[PDB]
Structures are given as C-alpha cells and as structure tokens.
Tab-separated table of C-alpha atoms and ligand atoms in Angstrom:
chain	number	residue	atom	x	y	z
P	17	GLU	CA	-73.023	69.042	2.568
P	18	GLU	CA	-74.176	66.108	0.040
P	19	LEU	CA	-75.445	62.448	0.880
P	20	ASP	CA	-72.356	60.819	2.651
P	21	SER	CA	-72.642	57.158	1.194
P	22	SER	CA	-70.416	55.829	4.157
P	23	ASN	CA	-72.705	57.140	6.761
P	24	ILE	CA	-76.244	55.381	5.651
P	25	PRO	CA	-78.293	54.553	8.633
P	26	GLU	CA	-78.015	50.615	8.870
P	27	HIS	CA	-81.764	50.523	9.966
P	28	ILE	CA	-84.586	53.220	9.333
P	29	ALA	CA	-88.185	53.018	10.666
P	30	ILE	CA	-90.855	54.854	8.799
P	31	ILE	CA	-94.566	55.586	10.244
P	32	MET	CA	-96.183	56.223	6.775
P	33	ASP	CA	-98.594	58.547	7.719
P	34	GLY	CA	-100.780	60.639	5.261
P	35	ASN	CA	-102.843	57.985	2.944
P	36	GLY	CA	-106.220	59.208	4.033
P	37	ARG	CA	-105.044	63.044	4.324
P	38	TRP	CA	-104.068	62.745	0.936
P	39	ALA	CA	-107.380	61.176	-0.304
P	40	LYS	CA	-109.670	63.485	1.465
P	41	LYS	CA	-107.513	66.688	-0.095
P	42	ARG	CA	-108.292	65.262	-3.576
P	43	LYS	CA	-112.156	64.252	-2.291
P	44	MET	CA	-111.499	60.592	-2.948
P	45	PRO	CA	-112.155	57.788	-0.817
P	46	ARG	CA	-109.229	56.629	1.218
P	47	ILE	CA	-108.619	53.493	-0.990
P	48	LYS	CA	-107.134	55.814	-3.617
P	49	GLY	CA	-104.749	56.976	-1.045
P	50	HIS	CA	-103.921	53.416	0.199
P	51	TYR	CA	-103.034	52.652	-3.943
P	52	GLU	CA	-100.690	55.450	-3.998
P	53	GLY	CA	-98.809	54.866	-0.618
P	54	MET	CA	-98.392	51.504	-2.184
P	55	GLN	CA	-96.283	52.951	-4.974
P	56	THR	CA	-94.310	55.047	-2.347
P	57	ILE	CA	-93.413	51.807	-0.485
P	58	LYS	CA	-91.943	50.360	-3.945
P	59	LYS	CA	-90.025	53.549	-4.396
P	60	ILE	CA	-88.583	53.829	-1.252
P	61	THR	CA	-87.790	50.250	-0.630
P	62	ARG	CA	-85.721	50.256	-4.102
P	63	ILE	CA	-83.695	53.367	-3.087
P	64	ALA	CA	-83.290	52.439	0.458
P	65	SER	CA	-81.519	49.108	-0.752
P	66	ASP	CA	-79.747	51.225	-3.518
P	67	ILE	CA	-77.890	53.585	-1.261
P	68	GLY	CA	-76.917	50.606	1.648
P	69	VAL	CA	-79.801	50.814	4.046
P	70	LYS	CA	-79.844	47.430	5.503
P	71	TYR	CA	-82.886	47.164	7.378
P	72	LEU	CA	-86.274	49.129	6.617
P	73	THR	CA	-88.963	48.944	9.338
P	74	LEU	CA	-92.709	50.301	7.955
P	75	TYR	CA	-95.641	51.198	10.150
P	76	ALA	CA	-98.869	51.873	8.171
P	77	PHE	CA	-100.581	54.185	10.224
P	78	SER	CA	-103.320	56.630	8.769
P	79	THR	CA	-103.778	59.802	11.125
P	80	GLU	CA	-107.569	60.478	10.801
P	81	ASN	CA	-108.334	61.605	14.275
P	82	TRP	CA	-105.458	62.701	16.305
P	83	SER	CA	-107.400	61.168	19.176
P	84	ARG	CA	-108.328	57.746	17.899
P	85	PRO	CA	-105.212	55.707	17.200
P	86	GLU	CA	-106.534	52.312	18.214
P	87	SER	CA	-108.978	52.598	14.906
P	88	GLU	CA	-105.658	52.377	12.999
P	89	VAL	CA	-103.700	49.444	14.657
P	90	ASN	CA	-105.796	46.449	13.225
P	91	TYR	CA	-107.424	47.966	10.312
P	92	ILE	CA	-107.270	46.170	6.849
P	93	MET	CA	-105.841	49.019	4.870
P	94	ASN	CA	-102.580	49.061	7.064
P	95	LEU	CA	-102.001	45.625	5.764
P	96	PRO	CA	-99.266	45.122	2.936
P	97	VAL	CA	-100.950	42.234	1.108
P	98	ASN	CA	-101.702	44.392	-1.831
P	99	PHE	CA	-97.945	45.669	-1.830
P	100	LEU	CA	-96.600	42.048	-1.364
P	101	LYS	CA	-98.847	40.196	-4.083
P	102	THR	CA	-97.914	42.966	-6.838
P	103	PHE	CA	-94.465	43.354	-6.209
P	104	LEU	CA	-93.250	40.272	-4.594
P	105	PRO	CA	-91.250	39.424	-7.991
P	106	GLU	CA	-89.412	42.428	-7.822
P	107	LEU	CA	-88.494	41.749	-4.203
P	108	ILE	CA	-87.314	38.273	-4.958
P	109	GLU	CA	-84.938	39.838	-7.804
P	110	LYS	CA	-84.007	42.773	-5.949
P	111	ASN	CA	-82.658	40.246	-3.093
P	112	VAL	CA	-84.949	41.970	-0.642
P	113	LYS	CA	-85.782	39.726	2.395
P	114	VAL	CA	-89.541	40.234	3.779
P	115	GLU	CA	-90.003	39.948	7.452
P	116	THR	CA	-92.696	41.060	10.096
P	117	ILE	CA	-93.437	42.049	13.654
P	118	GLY	CA	-96.377	42.533	15.386
P	119	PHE	CA	-99.641	40.143	16.159
P	120	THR	CA	-100.571	38.408	12.918
P	121	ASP	CA	-102.156	34.940	14.530
P	122	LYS	CA	-105.601	36.351	14.135
P	123	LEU	CA	-105.441	37.575	10.677
P	124	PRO	CA	-107.524	35.998	7.766
P	125	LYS	CA	-106.227	32.970	6.499
P	126	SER	CA	-105.945	34.290	2.817
P	127	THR	CA	-103.663	37.082	4.842
P	128	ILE	CA	-101.717	34.650	6.772
P	129	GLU	CA	-100.990	32.731	3.554
P	130	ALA	CA	-99.798	35.884	1.433
P	131	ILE	CA	-97.672	36.990	3.952
P	132	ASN	CA	-95.992	33.634	4.581
P	133	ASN	CA	-95.406	33.135	0.854
P	134	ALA	CA	-93.839	36.485	0.853
P	135	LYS	CA	-91.434	35.344	3.451
P	136	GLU	CA	-91.030	31.949	2.145
P	137	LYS	CA	-89.798	33.292	-1.164
P	138	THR	CA	-87.365	35.839	-0.207
P	139	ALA	CA	-85.887	33.502	2.891
P	140	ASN	CA	-82.881	33.243	1.435
P	141	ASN	CA	-82.319	36.955	0.275
P	142	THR	CA	-79.265	38.577	1.892
P	143	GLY	CA	-79.976	42.402	0.975
P	144	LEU	CA	-82.219	44.737	2.492
P	145	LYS	CA	-84.539	43.378	5.173
P	146	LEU	CA	-88.172	44.727	4.746
P	147	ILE	CA	-89.814	44.585	7.793
P	148	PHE	CA	-93.830	45.265	7.914
P	149	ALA	CA	-95.196	45.894	11.681
P	150	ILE	CA	-98.632	44.425	11.207
P	151	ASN	CA	-101.196	44.863	14.003
P	152	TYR	CA	-98.374	46.186	15.850
P	153	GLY	CA	-97.919	48.161	19.217
P	154	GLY	CA	-94.881	48.777	21.474
P	155	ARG	CA	-96.844	48.467	24.732
P	156	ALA	CA	-98.534	45.062	23.541
P	157	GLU	CA	-95.080	44.168	22.266
P	158	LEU	CA	-93.667	44.463	25.743
P	159	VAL	CA	-96.379	43.059	27.387
P	160	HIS	CA	-96.070	40.094	25.386
P	161	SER	CA	-92.487	40.029	25.873
P	162	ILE	CA	-92.877	40.133	29.409
P	163	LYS	CA	-95.230	37.591	29.827
P	164	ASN	CA	-93.369	35.127	28.164
P	165	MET	CA	-89.794	35.803	29.508
P	166	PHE	CA	-91.645	35.192	32.901
P	167	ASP	CA	-92.983	31.868	32.151
P	168	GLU	CA	-89.317	31.075	30.509
P	169	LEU	CA	-87.811	32.134	33.663
P	170	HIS	CA	-90.262	30.071	36.020
P	171	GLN	CA	-90.308	27.070	33.705
P	172	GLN	CA	-86.283	27.348	34.223
P	173	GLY	CA	-86.791	27.890	37.894
P	174	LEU	CA	-84.660	31.244	37.717
P	175	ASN	CA	-85.164	34.664	39.678
P	176	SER	CA	-85.700	37.973	37.976
P	177	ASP	CA	-81.849	38.680	38.405
P	178	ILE	CA	-81.063	37.803	35.011
P	179	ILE	CA	-83.492	40.388	33.560
P	180	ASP	CA	-81.625	43.242	32.156
P	181	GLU	CA	-81.841	45.631	29.251
P	182	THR	CA	-79.921	43.311	26.891
P	183	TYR	CA	-82.079	40.470	28.206
P	184	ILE	CA	-85.261	42.576	27.136
P	185	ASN	CA	-83.864	43.363	23.681
P	186	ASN	CA	-83.068	39.919	22.789
P	187	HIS	CA	-87.037	38.892	23.891
P	188	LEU	CA	-88.537	41.570	21.742
P	189	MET	CA	-89.946	40.819	18.151
P	190	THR	CA	-87.161	42.900	17.153
P	191	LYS	CA	-84.349	40.715	18.334
P	192	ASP	CA	-83.009	40.103	15.372
P	193	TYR	CA	-82.581	43.827	14.305
P	194	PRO	CA	-80.293	46.463	15.834
P	195	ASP	CA	-82.193	49.680	16.913
P	196	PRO	CA	-82.898	51.912	14.144
P	197	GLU	CA	-80.709	55.148	14.005
P	198	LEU	CA	-83.599	57.118	12.384
P	199	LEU	CA	-87.353	57.385	12.725
P	200	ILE	CA	-89.138	59.153	9.952
P	201	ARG	CA	-93.030	59.626	10.245
P	202	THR	CA	-94.856	61.693	7.155
P	203	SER	CA	-97.723	63.869	7.131
P	204	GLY	CA	-96.479	66.625	9.759
P	205	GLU	CA	-97.922	64.831	13.000
P	206	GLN	CA	-95.303	64.839	15.372
P	207	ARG	CA	-95.670	61.718	17.608
P	208	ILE	CA	-94.587	57.939	17.788
P	209	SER	CA	-98.125	56.582	18.142
P	210	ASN	CA	-96.862	53.577	20.291
P	211	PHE	CA	-94.848	52.581	17.590
P	212	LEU	CA	-91.117	50.803	18.567
P	213	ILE	CA	-91.382	52.815	21.887
P	214	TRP	CA	-88.268	50.752	23.392
P	215	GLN	CA	-86.404	50.483	20.343
P	216	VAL	CA	-86.323	54.368	19.466
P	217	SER	CA	-84.873	55.124	22.943
P	218	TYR	CA	-82.027	56.714	21.226
P	219	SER	CA	-83.229	57.065	17.582
P	220	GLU	CA	-82.838	60.184	15.676
P	221	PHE	CA	-86.490	61.666	14.908
P	222	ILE	CA	-87.653	63.473	11.522
P	223	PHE	CA	-90.982	64.708	11.347
P	224	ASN	CA	-91.152	65.390	7.521
P	225	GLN	CA	-94.438	67.251	6.437
P	226	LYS	CA	-95.000	65.373	3.139
P	227	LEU	CA	-98.002	63.059	2.911
P	228	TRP	CA	-96.636	59.429	2.630
P	229	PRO	CA	-98.194	59.316	-1.300
P	230	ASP	CA	-96.240	62.118	-1.617
P	231	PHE	CA	-93.045	61.209	-0.190
P	232	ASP	CA	-90.505	59.843	-2.592
P	233	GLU	CA	-86.633	58.918	-3.088
P	234	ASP	CA	-85.774	62.799	-3.108
P	235	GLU	CA	-87.458	63.331	0.118
P	236	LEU	CA	-85.977	60.287	1.866
P	237	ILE	CA	-82.227	61.452	0.645
P	238	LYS	CA	-83.063	64.913	2.330
P	239	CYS	CA	-83.895	63.031	5.179
P	240	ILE	CA	-80.638	61.220	5.677
P	241	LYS	CA	-79.080	64.329	4.899
P	242	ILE	CA	-80.507	66.276	7.748
P	243	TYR	CA	-79.788	62.908	9.841
P	244	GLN	CA	-76.007	63.225	8.531
P	245	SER	CA	-76.035	66.906	9.245
P	246	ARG	CA	-77.204	67.277	12.832
P	247	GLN	CA	-74.390	64.656	13.088
I	4	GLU	CA	-105.232	81.557	17.201
I	5	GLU	CA	-104.332	82.633	20.624
I	6	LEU	CA	-103.525	80.809	23.849
I	7	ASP	CA	-106.553	78.474	24.733
I	8	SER	CA	-106.813	78.560	28.511
I	9	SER	CA	-109.303	75.771	28.549
I	10	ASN	CA	-106.957	73.412	26.509
I	11	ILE	CA	-104.048	73.576	28.700
I	12	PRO	CA	-102.181	70.292	28.833
I	13	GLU	CA	-102.328	68.695	32.076
I	14	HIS	CA	-98.884	67.124	31.899
I	15	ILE	CA	-96.221	68.514	29.960
I	16	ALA	CA	-92.354	66.832	29.974
I	17	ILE	CA	-89.365	68.561	29.176
I	18	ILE	CA	-85.869	67.254	28.110
I	19	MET	CA	-83.600	70.713	29.266
I	20	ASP	CA	-81.003	70.354	26.756
I	21	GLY	CA	-78.554	73.218	25.740
I	22	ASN	CA	-76.714	74.453	29.031
I	23	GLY	CA	-73.190	73.040	28.119
I	24	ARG	CA	-74.071	74.441	24.289
I	25	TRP	CA	-75.036	77.700	25.621
I	26	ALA	CA	-71.727	77.918	27.772
I	27	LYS	CA	-69.443	76.679	25.168
I	28	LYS	CA	-70.693	79.353	22.732
I	29	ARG	CA	-70.026	82.110	25.203
I	30	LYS	CA	-66.367	80.405	25.788
I	31	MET	CA	-67.639	79.572	29.430
I	32	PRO	CA	-67.485	76.546	31.440
I	33	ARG	CA	-70.522	74.503	31.529
I	34	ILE	CA	-71.192	75.514	35.365
I	35	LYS	CA	-72.377	79.117	33.417
I	36	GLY	CA	-74.933	77.375	31.529
I	37	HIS	CA	-76.114	75.247	34.670
I	38	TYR	CA	-76.475	78.319	36.395
I	39	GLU	CA	-78.834	80.062	33.853
I	40	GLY	CA	-80.574	76.642	33.249
I	41	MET	CA	-81.642	76.883	36.725
I	42	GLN	CA	-83.246	80.161	36.330
I	43	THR	CA	-85.110	78.957	33.605
I	44	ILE	CA	-86.324	76.022	35.602
I	45	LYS	CA	-87.745	78.971	38.054
I	46	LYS	CA	-89.378	80.924	35.082
I	47	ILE	CA	-90.997	77.753	33.475
I	48	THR	CA	-92.323	76.606	36.854
I	49	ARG	CA	-93.943	79.732	37.643
I	50	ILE	CA	-95.535	79.940	34.342
I	51	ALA	CA	-96.657	76.472	33.930
I	52	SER	CA	-98.437	76.964	37.333
I	53	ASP	CA	-99.916	80.285	36.383
I	54	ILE	CA	-101.458	78.800	32.934
I	55	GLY	CA	-102.761	75.530	34.864
I	56	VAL	CA	-100.560	72.892	34.071
I	57	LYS	CA	-100.833	70.124	36.682
I	58	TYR	CA	-97.750	68.319	36.106
I	59	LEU	CA	-94.280	68.977	34.808
I	60	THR	CA	-91.762	66.389	34.652
I	61	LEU	CA	-88.207	68.070	33.885
I	62	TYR	CA	-84.955	65.586	32.648
I	63	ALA	CA	-81.858	67.701	33.147
I	64	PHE	CA	-79.822	66.411	30.094
I	65	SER	CA	-76.944	68.397	28.364
I	66	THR	CA	-76.279	67.093	24.491
I	67	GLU	CA	-72.185	67.344	24.427
I	68	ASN	CA	-71.443	64.370	22.155
I	69	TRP	CA	-74.541	62.959	20.240
I	70	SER	CA	-73.102	59.423	20.842
I	71	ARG	CA	-72.416	59.340	24.703
I	72	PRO	CA	-75.652	59.879	26.470
I	73	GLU	CA	-74.445	57.570	29.371
I	74	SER	CA	-72.255	60.362	30.457
I	75	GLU	CA	-75.075	62.732	31.538
I	76	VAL	CA	-77.668	60.207	33.239
I	77	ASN	CA	-75.823	60.233	36.597
I	78	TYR	CA	-73.555	63.534	36.063
I	79	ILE	CA	-73.868	65.731	39.291
I	80	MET	CA	-74.687	68.710	36.968
I	81	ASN	CA	-77.871	67.188	36.101
I	82	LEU	CA	-78.907	67.403	39.700
I	83	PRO	CA	-81.528	69.901	40.724
I	84	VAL	CA	-80.142	70.334	44.397
I	85	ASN	CA	-79.018	73.994	43.629
I	86	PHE	CA	-82.453	74.709	42.603
I	87	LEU	CA	-84.303	73.252	45.518
I	88	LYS	CA	-82.265	75.038	47.935
I	89	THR	CA	-82.514	78.513	46.082
I	90	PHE	CA	-85.953	78.156	45.060
I	91	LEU	CA	-87.629	76.167	47.983
I	92	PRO	CA	-89.239	78.958	49.971
I	93	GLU	CA	-90.864	80.309	46.613
I	94	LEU	CA	-92.028	76.758	45.501
I	95	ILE	CA	-93.722	76.150	49.376
I	96	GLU	CA	-95.625	79.598	48.604
I	97	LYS	CA	-96.333	78.681	45.106
I	98	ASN	CA	-98.531	75.770	46.504
I	99	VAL	CA	-96.021	73.565	44.123
I	100	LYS	CA	-95.453	69.982	45.380
I	101	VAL	CA	-91.740	68.430	44.661
I	102	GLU	CA	-91.480	64.999	43.435
I	103	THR	CA	-89.011	62.644	41.910
I	104	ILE	CA	-88.615	59.735	39.493
I	105	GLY	CA	-85.251	57.520	38.764
I	106	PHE	CA	-82.751	55.812	41.028
I	107	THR	CA	-81.852	58.297	43.966
I	108	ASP	CA	-80.978	55.457	46.550
I	109	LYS	CA	-77.135	55.781	45.717
I	110	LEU	CA	-77.115	59.907	45.295
I	111	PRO	CA	-74.628	61.535	48.150
I	112	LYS	CA	-76.325	61.438	51.710
I	113	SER	CA	-76.253	65.237	51.647
I	114	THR	CA	-78.028	65.367	48.174
I	115	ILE	CA	-80.647	62.712	49.184
I	116	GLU	CA	-81.444	65.079	52.281
I	117	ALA	CA	-81.913	68.260	49.906
I	118	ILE	CA	-84.366	66.364	47.953
I	119	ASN	CA	-85.985	64.879	50.893
I	120	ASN	CA	-86.349	68.095	52.755
I	121	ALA	CA	-88.002	69.821	49.498
I	122	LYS	CA	-90.548	66.979	49.217
I	123	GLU	CA	-91.249	67.073	52.934
I	124	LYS	CA	-91.660	70.905	52.949
I	125	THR	CA	-94.078	70.678	50.057
I	126	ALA	CA	-95.703	67.500	50.529
I	127	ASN	CA	-98.952	69.089	51.471
I	128	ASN	CA	-99.302	71.564	48.494
I	129	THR	CA	-101.900	70.900	46.006
I	130	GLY	CA	-101.007	72.933	43.038
I	131	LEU	CA	-98.438	72.097	40.043
I	132	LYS	CA	-96.687	68.760	40.790
I	133	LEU	CA	-92.854	69.637	39.918
I	134	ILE	CA	-91.213	66.345	39.097
I	135	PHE	CA	-87.719	65.790	38.780
I	136	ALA	CA	-86.418	62.723	36.809
I	137	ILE	CA	-82.994	61.991	38.477
I	138	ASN	CA	-80.460	59.380	37.548
I	139	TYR	CA	-83.421	58.398	35.523
I	140	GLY	CA	-83.613	56.221	32.186
I	141	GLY	CA	-86.574	54.719	30.719
I	142	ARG	CA	-85.185	51.173	30.087
I	143	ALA	CA	-83.999	50.989	33.639
I	144	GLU	CA	-87.140	52.283	34.727
I	145	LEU	CA	-88.936	49.287	32.786
I	146	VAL	CA	-86.344	46.756	33.923
I	147	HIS	CA	-86.923	47.564	37.312
I	148	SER	CA	-90.375	47.814	37.207
I	149	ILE	CA	-90.346	44.234	35.694
I	150	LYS	CA	-88.365	42.591	38.285
I	151	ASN	CA	-90.728	43.856	41.271
I	152	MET	CA	-93.877	42.834	39.361
I	153	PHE	CA	-92.179	39.162	38.733
I	154	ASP	CA	-91.723	38.971	42.594
I	155	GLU	CA	-94.921	40.717	43.470
I	156	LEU	CA	-96.322	37.755	41.550
I	157	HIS	CA	-94.391	34.866	42.553
I	158	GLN	CA	-94.388	36.000	46.346
I	159	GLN	CA	-98.527	35.999	45.649
I	160	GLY	CA	-98.270	33.073	43.712
I	161	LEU	CA	-99.835	34.207	40.507
I	162	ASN	CA	-99.458	33.668	36.925
I	163	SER	CA	-98.602	36.302	34.199
I	164	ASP	CA	-101.906	36.472	33.133
I	165	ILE	CA	-102.829	39.624	35.302
I	166	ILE	CA	-99.858	41.541	33.265
I	167	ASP	CA	-101.462	43.763	30.977
I	168	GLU	CA	-101.028	47.468	29.833
I	169	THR	CA	-102.829	48.398	32.750
I	170	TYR	CA	-100.818	46.584	35.315
I	171	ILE	CA	-97.702	48.099	33.848
I	172	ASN	CA	-98.764	51.592	33.939
I	173	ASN	CA	-99.295	51.304	37.580
I	174	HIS	CA	-95.981	49.770	38.284
I	175	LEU	CA	-94.019	52.444	36.819
I	176	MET	CA	-92.049	55.334	38.643
I	177	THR	CA	-94.574	57.734	37.004
I	178	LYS	CA	-98.034	55.151	38.148
I	179	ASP	CA	-99.278	58.396	40.059
I	180	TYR	CA	-99.191	60.777	36.854
I	181	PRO	CA	-100.971	60.843	33.955
I	182	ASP	CA	-98.910	60.260	30.817
I	183	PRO	CA	-97.527	63.569	29.127
I	184	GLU	CA	-99.963	65.170	26.315
I	185	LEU	CA	-96.763	67.168	25.300
I	186	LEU	CA	-92.922	66.127	25.359
I	187	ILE	CA	-90.769	69.456	24.691
I	188	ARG	CA	-86.811	68.943	24.032
I	189	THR	CA	-84.956	72.256	23.565
I	190	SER	CA	-81.488	72.665	21.651
I	191	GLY	CA	-82.969	71.532	18.349
I	192	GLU	CA	-81.689	67.966	18.990
I	193	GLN	CA	-84.621	65.675	18.156
I	194	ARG	CA	-84.196	62.505	20.309
I	195	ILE	CA	-85.903	61.096	23.476
I	196	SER	CA	-82.904	60.011	24.707
I	197	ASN	CA	-84.325	57.172	26.741
I	198	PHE	CA	-86.536	59.398	28.831
I	199	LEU	CA	-90.126	58.163	29.529
I	200	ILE	CA	-89.998	55.894	26.352
I	201	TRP	CA	-93.281	53.898	27.684
I	202	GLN	CA	-95.183	57.126	29.124
I	203	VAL	CA	-94.649	59.286	25.770
I	204	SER	CA	-96.307	56.374	23.573
I	205	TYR	CA	-99.035	58.710	22.462
I	206	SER	CA	-97.497	62.309	23.612
I	207	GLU	CA	-97.187	65.151	20.766
I	208	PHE	CA	-93.600	65.809	20.395
I	209	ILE	CA	-91.824	69.413	20.126
I	210	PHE	CA	-88.369	70.151	19.287
I	211	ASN	CA	-87.754	73.914	20.168
I	212	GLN	CA	-84.721	75.449	18.805
I	213	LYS	CA	-83.712	77.415	21.706
I	214	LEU	CA	-80.938	76.218	24.072
I	215	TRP	CA	-82.461	75.531	27.420
I	216	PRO	CA	-80.719	78.902	29.332
I	217	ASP	CA	-82.437	81.043	26.557
I	218	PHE	CA	-85.925	79.147	26.496
I	219	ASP	CA	-88.528	81.194	28.357
I	220	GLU	CA	-92.230	81.905	29.514
I	221	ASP	CA	-92.668	83.194	25.835
I	222	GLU	CA	-91.268	80.397	24.226
I	223	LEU	CA	-93.256	77.702	26.208
I	224	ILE	CA	-96.599	79.430	25.419
I	225	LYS	CA	-95.494	79.319	21.743
I	226	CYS	CA	-94.927	75.451	22.141
I	227	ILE	CA	-98.441	74.943	23.705
I	228	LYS	CA	-100.062	77.109	20.923
I	229	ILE	CA	-98.096	74.974	18.209
I	230	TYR	CA	-99.626	71.729	20.472
I	231	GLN	CA	-103.068	73.537	20.164
I	232	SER	CA	-103.132	74.223	16.667
I	233	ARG	CA	-101.581	70.676	15.549
I	234	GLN	CA	-104.898	69.528	17.208
U	307	MG	MG1	-104.212	53.316	3.607
U	308	MG	MG1	-85.059	33.111	25.475
U	309	MG	MG1	-75.915	71.840	33.557
U	310	MG	MG1	-98.687	46.401	43.235
C-alpha cells in the first residue's frame, strides 16, 4: 500500500555504494561523485529524521573492483569530514546526534578534531542518531571486542561461562544501538562487504539499483515500502 | 553470456527456504513440502557436483513467520535424516563426502547414528563436500568458538595478542572450508537469518524468488550465471 508511518524502522543501516561508478560514467574523477554523495547524505538524513527513523548507520564504501574491498576501508574519501564541516549547523538545528563506530585513533589529528567537534556540538541532541562507520570492519570489530572481553574477564578473574550472545552485543562498538531492522546497499552490488556482520544477523536486506549519488528521499521511502510489504 | 565452466564457485551456501509456504499454497501439511524439498536437495547435489562445485553448505529453514526464526533452528523437519537414509547409496557412488556443522550433541540417539553412518560411509570420498548445517546459528557458533579459544589460550597460558581474523577462521565450525563465494536463499525472503554470519562477510548474495521445492538445476545454473555477470 502506502508508507505506514507507524511501522518505520527504528534503525536503518546503509552502505553508500556508487560514488566512484557515478563519476566514471560521466568521465569525471571520483571526487565529483564524492561531493554528490555528500548531498545524498544530507537528503537522507533529513527525510530519515522527518519520518521517524531513530538510528541511521552509514558506511561509505565505493565498489571500484569487486575483488579489492580493503582499498576502501581506510580510504580518505570514505570519511565524512566534508559532510560534517559543511552540514554541522543543520545537524545541530535538526536535533540530530552525531556518533561513530570503527577505528579512528590513527586518523589525522585534524580529522579527529573535526569528528570530535561534531560529536561535542550535538552531544545533547535527542533526535536521530547519525552514526558514521569510519575505518570499520565487522571482523575487525569482533576481533577487537573479543580481545577486550578476554582481558576484562581475566582481570576480574572469571571464566568464559558468562560469555553469551547478550554479552557480545554489549561489547561491540554498537552496544548502545538496537540492531538494524533494515540494511540497504546501493549501486546494485549485493554483498555486505564486512559491514555489521554480527548486527545484521536478522536484518531485512534491500539491494537498491541506484548509485548513491542518485539515491534520494523518494527512493528511501520506496525501500521502506518494500520492507513493509515483505512484512 | 553462458555458463563459464572455468569460473564455477568452489563453495556455494544455500538457505533452503520455502517448504512450508509451498505446502500451504497447495493446502497440504508442511510434510508434503519437506518431502519435495528433499528431492530438490538430490537434484542440486548432483548438478553442483557435475559442474565443479567443491563445497555445498545447506541450511534447512522454512520462513513461516518472519518474526520467529528460533522455531526453525532446532525443528525436526529441518533435519536431513530422511535425505541421508534414502540417498546415501547415491552419495557414496557419486563420490560425495557428507559433513555437518552445528550443535548435534543433543539430537536423538537414532538421529546421531544416521548422521554418523552417512559421514563414515563417505569419509573417504574426494568429490563434493555436502555440508548440512544442523541446529546451527552463526551467533551461537561464534559464542562457542570464543569460549573454547579462551580456554585454549588460558590453558596454554597465553594472552589475547594471538587472536586475529585468521585465528578466528581456524576456530569456527567451518575451519576446514573456504568461505562461500555465493550465498543463495530461496522463496524471496531477503535475510541471512543468522546463517554463516562471519563466513559470508564478502559473499555475493542472490535472493531467488522460487520456493525451495520448485528450485531446480536450471535455476541453480541461472543463479551462478547472475553471479558471473555481476563479475
Ligand atoms: Mg567517495
Ligand atoms: Mg563490560
Ligand atoms: Mg521442511
Ligand atoms: Mg586450536
């Protein structure tokens, strides 16, 4: 039917794929697609907020070569620095709370500052939680969470008997958020590329054909409608 | 183009969804769909072997209620007992090696025997590895692997520094198999429902619309063709 405003997913996760491809189709360097992709983030953040989404996890990843995803994980163009610097005022006004998951400790000093300022300035907002997965990988997340949990247990002198599914959820970088009911990936590529592998165990998947730069509010609504129709 | 016999995935994983739905459409009890689903397993096992697939992991799961997957995990009708008893001779002759992943220690004594006999009788085969995920869950698998790795490390008096991605792969129930290049799920439902969550980190996903009982050799080839076209 039409968009059911009373069944809007609390948490939508999106792999923003297509910036490079979009640029290449127009014989332009990837930076042009990176810029347009940034505009898509603004559009999607506003509409998500306006329809009731409470958590939005975005993973910047551009499929260049299907067999080389490692090149994207820590690539500068997958950073939301430009977005945060040019849209922060709006985020603040829109009651959006900025957060991040991933390994950011080794990012450029000026990058850490930009991200921290964004968080600090929106720390008190109570609306949509805009979560950027930066230099993130599900396997790396688990490996990291496993190491800590082990030390946390040994330090406290305990056995592995307390380790269960719930324990793991509370020790992932996503411990403060419910798992996404819906995972969307643009461009038509159908993989989760090591993104929230544990968290999307029960998520509904939607592989949207449009390139991230062309993805818009209308398309988002359509994805949620599909989500609602599939029950 | 056409099926490229030199680029056949080494490992295909399939969530055999649709047995219940298929039966319900025909106003028959699920057992009728369970039986036809068994015939699909035979068809798919033969063609997979005949085209060069080296590992085939099958997960019996029937989507009855999208919001209650726990009811399927340990349900008797998702056991391959009937399949193994009626097709073992063929498996032996076809040089197929039967294996399993999952928690089988608490299954009925007669069920454990049927599964063990199937394994024993095909233990020396060198062709397709037919892997049945029984009473299996990716999260449970990880929780279990994490517990052991911890004890294995403490017992040996070691720190968590040796724990990396590779270490985890070698301690999962799937340690002897390469990750699947392709994950297929029938019926049109698009979720991985806690199946091989770690292992499908980079897998290509194909959500085939046909119900498992209607899925056949032709459809499998088509899925692989799609896989090859998407590059
Ligand atoms: Mg980009
Ligand atoms: Mg803790
Ligand atoms: Mg069945
Ligand atoms: Mg070991």
